Amino acid sequence: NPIIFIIILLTIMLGTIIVMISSHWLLVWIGFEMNMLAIIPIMMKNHNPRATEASTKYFLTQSTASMLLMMAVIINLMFSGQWTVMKLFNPMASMLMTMALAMKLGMAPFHFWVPEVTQGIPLSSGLILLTWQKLAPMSVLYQIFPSINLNLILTLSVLSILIGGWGGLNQTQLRKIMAYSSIAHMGWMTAVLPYNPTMTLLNLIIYIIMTSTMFTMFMANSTTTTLSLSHTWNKTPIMTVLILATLLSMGGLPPLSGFMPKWMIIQEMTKNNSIILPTFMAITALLNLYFYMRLTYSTTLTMFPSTNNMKMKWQFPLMKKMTFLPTMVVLSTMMLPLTPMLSV
Amino acid sequence: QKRLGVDLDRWMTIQSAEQPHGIPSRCHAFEKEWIECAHGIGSIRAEKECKIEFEDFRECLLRQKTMKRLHAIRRQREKLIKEGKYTPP
Amino acid sequence: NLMLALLTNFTLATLLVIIAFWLPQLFSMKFFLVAITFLLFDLEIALLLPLPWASQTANLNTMLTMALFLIILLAVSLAYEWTQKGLE
Amino acid sequence: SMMKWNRERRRLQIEDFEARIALMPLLQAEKDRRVLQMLRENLEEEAT
Amino acid sequence: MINILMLIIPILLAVAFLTLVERKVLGYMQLRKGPNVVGPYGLLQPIADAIKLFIKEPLRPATSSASMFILAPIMALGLALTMWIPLPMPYPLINMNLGVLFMLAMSSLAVYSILWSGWASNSKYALIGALRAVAQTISYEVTLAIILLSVLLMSGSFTLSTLITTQEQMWLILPAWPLAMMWFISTLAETNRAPFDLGPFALFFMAEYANIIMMNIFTAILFLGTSHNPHMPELYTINFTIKSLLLTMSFLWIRASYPRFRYDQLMHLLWKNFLPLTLALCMWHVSLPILTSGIP
Amino acid sequence: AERVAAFLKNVWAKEPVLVASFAIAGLAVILPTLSPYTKYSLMINXXXXXXXXXXXXXXXXXXXXXXXXXXXXXXXXXXX
Amino acid sequence: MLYIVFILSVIFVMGFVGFSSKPSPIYGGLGLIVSGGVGCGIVLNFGGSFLGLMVFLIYLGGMMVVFGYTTAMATEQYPEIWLSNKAVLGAFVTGLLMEFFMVYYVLKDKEVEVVFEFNGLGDWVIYDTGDSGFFSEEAMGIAALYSYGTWLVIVTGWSLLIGVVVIMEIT
Amino acid sequence: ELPSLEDLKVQEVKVSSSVLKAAAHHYGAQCDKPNKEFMLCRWEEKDPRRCLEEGKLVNQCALEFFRQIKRHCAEPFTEYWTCIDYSGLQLFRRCRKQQAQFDECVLDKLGWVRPDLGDLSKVTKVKTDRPLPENPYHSRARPEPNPEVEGDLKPARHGSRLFF
Amino acid sequence: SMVYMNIMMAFTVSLVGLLMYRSHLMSSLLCLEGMMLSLFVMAALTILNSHFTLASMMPIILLVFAACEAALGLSLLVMVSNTYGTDYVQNLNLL
Structure with a gap:
């Protein structure tokens, strides 16, 4: 595909800009549906039966998500009648606002599409456009941080790490593990929103970079654990060392800068007399680490995936941000712990 | 807003703003109180200082307080059936 | 009344159907693209509807730059359609 | 030929809107009625 | 309210007497003669066709799918007669807030009449043949919307009564000179047989012939009019009947003279030939009331 | 000429309706900026009062008088 | 007789009863003609x-017309009768009993609801407006404008450029 | 709420027809001051409860204008009025010939005055009645906002985080 | 209050109608049209009663984006009928 693929990709970039730079309620409504028209062609790409099934499952869940969001916009005319994105002014519209944004994100009750959508994506270039897409509903949630009830956000954040922590244990597909770490990390996202809206934006920065480092290192084609197994000996051994720095960082480990969200999310919550919730956060986070525990053994060990066919010609992929971003993803906890102020 | 629109105008969002020609809002006078009450951050986080001016503004759009009142008159008008009822028009 | 004008037309239309029945005694996916183009052009026409309706009061220097712009992209969409459209 | 007729319509339309501006007892008829209707409503409230 | 009944029964007579004029004008265009054995000059045949087709002629059901086949004539005959309501014949029957919006909508809702009849038959060859006929009706309504929006942009609002006032001395044929040619072709959309051709058979084309008169009168207001004269409504109506019927003969002219376009090439007439021309005129008609002052 | 004379007469021979699609739409953009006649249309458009007039309380003010015919205010008299 | 909007609103929900029920896409397609056409009258x-x-x-002159094509493309020929279909009639009968049973409580004006808002009279306060304006008024006399909302014109144009390009790449 | 009394509305009103008033826009030129006094009252004070005595002067002056037409040139005025009702909704077209018969009769009197431009917002300097600032709707002044911190910020602690 | 007790009820009925299935995938997209139709009426009543004048353009824009989804999602439905015989919810491959 020539220029038209870049134009479609630029309209997702432009689509989230309408969401970011906004004041009107129908303006963000357009911004969400600008993405809906633009992700689907990249979802298809290679003319697959899996791609047709994934896109239809992606659309029918996210089209209903937007129409539930528009109901919250119309109730904002029923009561008050002000079309400025600041507060919902309703105990009813706030319910239909948070649950609609939960549909677009990987939050607890509306998570079922996430693993099956990720499987149907043809290439690693399309796999980024779900992790980057989650910036759009998060940007609205930052704007309407008050007037939203704790009983139907924090319950959806706690359950998502529970179902995320058990949702990747019986899975071997590399796309499916990344799809359930998405559900796992979204619980750490929305838990901060009541206890200071700050650090939610920084949690995005850590997550989006760390997820993009994975798929750019998955440019050497691998879909399963057994296909990423034949990489230690048949392919380059230095590549297994750099993926190890990204696998272990996604779980809660302090020498790596993937502990930098788990630094402040617990810290800000403990300030507001809540200890029983951050305990439940950190223990369930070990189940998220446990996926990468068995996935590190694919790279650290021999595991016998030799294969008679040996590659002599050197691999030439895109690798656009595959060098600059993992250096920041591995070490930033010693570099910038004062970056909380710089981001938000 | 996550990112502000500086040196550019794309608002026209709030009620009782710049009219298309000169056409007024149905609740124009009530927001002349509401916007003037809550232009600062004092009654934005607490929302207690402008409670008097919000209840009358909520009454403008819904008309629920008049709806309960007019129903009470209509029920008592129906109570006058086979009693001391009079109709001037 | 508008309802009085509508119902009288429909009731006499159904009355002719009563005369018509009671009185006697004895695949191809290419055509889908047409419907796609039609529906997408309707909305651009729907946005170009208030032209002899809003131009009476509003400023002309602001409108003309935007009014032509909708018809331009309505032709730019057709410019993309020209490069391999179909046999139909 | 069309634009010369449109400018003739401009002379008519300004005269049409002038009749709207000139009439203010038309606006007075509204506010006189609103007081009289409310007084009948108040008498209905006193009776019921 | 007797006026509605005075716009159904004499209107259905005009549809009935159309079959004679379609046979007589096309007849004289083909050197043959019209009906003569029936009456004095064959004038007793439209009532003779009504007794033949309705009373004794039965219907052998192909499948009869419960709700449909009986629902499709309601969408055909009913929607064709509702189009007569907002027409600015001196003083119209309950004048609409917006005239042409009701005119364009009920014509675009008339597409269902051929759609539901496609569902009425169980056979696949009927519905594929039906959708091909829908494809012609669906496409030319885009041009029907564009040409209307460029004619009104010259003068008048959506009200049909204001379209009479603009044609006080000059017709809208001359300022909209390429659009006058364009609108005449785009009116051949509702299975007019001149560009391309696909309950009982009788009442189904009674709605289709009614739409031909409907477009003939719609051309006689948007492009014709001459004057209004509020003092005498008679002088307008006599003059209107001549203007409308001269355009009615022209629809019997294109059908007589010209063969079928080939369905594909008829779809190549639109998008490739018509739509680049109409949108360029639509661009041109935006600039005209701004270039020279004329925004009523 | 390399394409001015070459790629114009070919367009007249091969699909001349495409000439009309660029020329008439082209004149629709260029001519409104060039013509010194667009200024008159904006003047009457603002002059036409759809809403009711409002009276302002004057305390030492110029270019304002009574509702009767007097040399005051805007009141456009462009070509009668 | 006295009510104008409230009688049409019942027919509006009655159309949607055929959407909660699944009486085959053809009969469900007839719902958008009934509820859509009545839906105009509520606005009017x-x-x-x-x-x-x-x-x-758009809805009655485009949307369902294009939806008429796809019913012929997939799941075509014959629609199965909803009287013979199991649970489809069960969803239909439970759907109407959520509305028709409620109307009986709307009688005598005020009614109890799941939400705090009551029904009311809906005859004198049905219009909710006095005189308001005069010439080119009624809020929608000058409804849509290219002026002031210049930004919204561009973004609508962007999405309609996307639509033509994207569907071509899908098929 | 406290509305006006039952005997507050002025007697002798709406005697003229809807189009009979629309036939003569000379009412905009002669008897214009009392109309402008009521107009200025409404924009200053939005309530009809206060500006009703000014409206009594409007209804009184309106009858004074129409009685002059009742006394003199009744024949060309009624002929113009029958012409204005005979037409549909044009209201000014197809009646210009009988508009020539009008004004010509009125030219003998001082009543004839026709503007060929419009009103274009006329100012009333003679108006006093009541002062404009008197709080039209406002009851509370609204509590004072957060005080703006004046002065340049200085680094003192240098990061109040866990380290450095 | 009066009308809003029906059009909100019609929205909740269509909300059930989307998520309930009898194997037909065409009926879900048909209900998405109804969902936007119910949102159209609910927005229209809020803007027309409280004379906004400016907000009247917003449901017209909403109508455009109603048809944006209810065509591009409809085009994907055709692609299911290209790969498989007839469109069914039961006919799936993803795990």
């Missing part, structure tokens, strides 16, 4: 003739 009663006729031009 409060005013704004332009906005009421938008459903006639």
Whole structure:
């Protein structure tokens, strides 16, 4: 595909800009549906039966998500009648606002599409456009941080790490593990929103970079654990060392800068007399680490995936941000712990 | 807003703003109180200082307080059936 | 009344159907693209509807730059359609 | 030929809107009625 | 309210007497003669066709799918007669807030009449043949919307009564000179047989012939009019009947003279030939009331 | 000429309706900026009062008088 | 007789009963003709003739017409009768009993609801407006404008450029 | 709420027809001051409860204008009025010939005055009645906002985080 | 209050109608049209009663984006009928 693929990709970039730079309620409504028209062609790409099934499952869940969001916009005319994105002014519209944004994100009750959508994506270039897409509903949630009830956000954040922590244990597909770490990390996202809206934006920065480092290192084609197994000996051994720095960082480990969200999310919550919730956060986070525990053994060990066919010609992929971003993803906890102020 | 629109105008969002020609809002006078009450951050986080001016503004759009009142008159008008009822028009 | 004008037309239309029945005694996916183009052009026409309706009061220097712009992209969409459209 | 007729319509339309501006007892008829209707409503409230 | 009944029964007579004029004008265009054995000059045949087709002629059901086949004539005959309501014949029957919006909508809702009849038959060859006929009706309504929006942009609002006032001395044929040619072709959309051709058979084309008169009168207001004269409504109506019927003969002219376009090439007439021309005129008609002052 | 004379007469021979699609739409953009006649249309458009007039309380003010015919205010008299 | 909007609103929900029920896409397609056409009348009663006729031009003059094509493309020929279908009639009978049983409580004006809002009279306060304006008024006399909302014109144009390009790449 | 009394509305009103008033826009030129006094009252004070005595002067002056037409040139005025009702909704077209018969009769009197431009917002300097600032709707002044911190910020602690 | 007790009820009925299935995938997209139709009426009543004048353009824009989804999602439905015989919810491959 020539220029038209870049134009479609630029309209997702432009689509989230309408969401970011906004004041009107129908303006963000357009911004969400600008993405809906633009992700689907990249979802298809290679003319697959899996791609047709994934896109239809992606659309029918996210089209209903937007129409539930528009109901919250119309109730904002029923009561008050002000079309400025600041507060919902309703105990009813706030319910239909948070649950609609939960549909677009990987939050607890509306998570079922996430693993099956990720499987149907043809290439690693399309796999980024779900992790980057989650910036759009998060940007609205930052704007309407008050007037939203704790009983139907924090319950959806706690359950998502529970179902995320058990949702990747019986899975071997590399796309499916990344799809359930998405559900796992979204619980750490929305838990901060009541206890200071700050650090939610920084949690995005850590997550989006760390997820993009994975798929750019998955440019050497691998879909399963057994296909990423034949990489230690048949392919380059230095590549297994750099993926190890990204696998272990996604779980809660302090020498790596993937502990930098788990630094402040617990810290800000403990300030507001809540200890029983951050305990439940950190223990369930070990189940998220446990996926990468068995996935590190694919790279650290021999595991016998030799294969008679040996590659002599050197691999030439895109690798656009595959060098600059993992250096920041591995070490930033010693570099910038004062970056909380710089981001938000 | 996550990112502000500086040196550019794309608002026209709030009620009782710049009219298309000169056409007024149905609740124009009530927001002349509401916007003037809550232009600062004092009654934005607490929302207690402008409670008097919000209840009358909520009454403008819904008309629920008049709806309960007019129903009470209509029920008592129906109570006058086979009693001391009079109709001037 | 508008309802009085509508119902009288429909009731006499159904009355002719009563005369018509009671009185006697004895695949191809290419055509889908047409419907796609039609529906997408309707909305651009729907946005170009208030032209002899809003131009009476509003400023002309602001409108003309935007009014032509909708018809331009309505032709730019057709410019993309020209490069391999179909046999139909 | 069309634009010369449109400018003739401009002379008519300004005269049409002038009749709207000139009439203010038309606006007075509204506010006189609103007081009289409310007084009948108040008498209905006193009776019921 | 007797006026509605005075716009159904004499209107259905005009549809009935159309079959004679379609046979007589096309007849004289083909050197043959019209009906003569029936009456004095064959004038007793439209009532003779009504007794033949309705009373004794039965219907052998192909499948009869419960709700449909009986629902499709309601969408055909009913929607064709509702189009007569907002027409600015001196003083119209309950004048609409917006005239042409009701005119364009009920014509675009008339597409269902051929759609539901496609569902009425169980056979696949009927519905594929039906959708091909829908494809012609669906496409030319885009041009029907564009040409209307460029004619009104010259003068008048959506009200049909204001379209009479603009044609006080000059017709809208001359300022909209390429659009006058364009609108005449785009009116051949509702299975007019001149560009391309696909309950009982009788009442189904009674709605289709009614739409031909409907477009003939719609051309006689948007492009014709001459004057209004509020003092005498008679002088307008006599003059209107001549203007409308001269355009009615022209629809019997294109059908007589010209063969079928080939369905594909008829779809190549639109998008490739018509739509680049109409949108360029639509661009041109935006600039005209701004270039020279004329925004009523 | 390399394409001015070459790629114009070919367009007249091969699909001349495409000439009309660029020329008439082209004149629709260029001519409104060039013509010194667009200024008159904006003047009457603002002059036409759809809403009711409002009276302002004057305390030492110029270019304002009574509702009767007097040399005051805007009141456009462009070509009668 | 006295009510105008409330009688039409019942027929509006009655159309949606055929959407909660699944009586095959053909009979469900007839729902958008019934509920859509009546849906115009609900908009038209409060005013704004332009906005009421938008459903006639787009939903009834495009949307369901294109949806008429796809019913012929997939799941075509014959629609199965809803009387013979199991649970489809069960969803239909439970759907109407959520509305028709409620109307009996709306009688005598006020009614109890799941939400805090009551029914009311809906006859004198049905219009909710006095005189308001005069010439080119009724809120939707000058409804849509290219002026002031210049930004919204561009973004709508962007999405309609996307639509033509994207569907071509899908098929 | 406290509305006006039952005997507050002025007697002798709405005697003229809807189009009979629309036939003569000379009412905009002669008897214009009392109309402008009521107009200025409404924009200053939005309530009809206060500006009703000014409206009594409007209804009184309106009858004074129409009685002059009742006394003199009744024949060309009624002929113009029958012409204005005979037409549909044009209201000014197809009646210009009988508009020539009008004004010509009125030219003998001082009543004839026709503007060929419009009103274009006329100012009333003679108006006093009541002062404009008197709080039209406002009851509370609204509590004072957060005080703006004046002065340049200085680094003192240098990061109040866990380290450095 | 009066009308809003029906059009909100019609929205909740269509909300059930989307998520309930009898194997037909065409009926879900048909209900998505109804969902936007119910959102159209609910927005129209709020803007027309409280004379906004500016907000009247917003449901017209909403009508455009109603048809944006209810065509591009409809085009994907055709692609299911290209790969498989007839469109069914039961006919799936993803795990």
